[PDB]
Amino acid sequence: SQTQGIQQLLQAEKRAAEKVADARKRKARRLKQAKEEAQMEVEQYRREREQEFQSKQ
């Protein structure tokens, strides 16, 4: 590898780092999405429980 191989290696490493970093950022945002969606789910569960409380009362 005189010059072509070094160029291809550099692009390969840059793309690899981009893949890993993008996956990490996706994971972070997706964890935030998990927390938000499940918070809404628990809000719905709370609404159900309050309705049942009203019926019981």
Binding site: Q8, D22, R30, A34, K35, A38, E41, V42, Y45, F53
Partner: protein
């Protein structure tokens, strides 16, 4: 006599794992992002649901 054929042989040897193993690392990071969807949703808000159930 090597010319650029030997260069391309080493590049065929090298690229196909240096780029693809990082791709697989990205894919398993996403898979663990799904597993952590599940872990967060079954631990944090699960404890929250248990607390409110205790209150109820």
């Amino acid at each position: 006599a090597l010319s650029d054929a030997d260069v391309q042989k080493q590049i065929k040897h090298m690229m196909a794992f240096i780029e693809q193993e990082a791709n697989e690392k990205a894919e398993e990071i996403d898979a663990k992002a799904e597993e952590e969807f599940n872990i967060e949703k079954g631990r944090l808000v699960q404890t929250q649901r248990l607390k409110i159930m205790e209150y109820y």
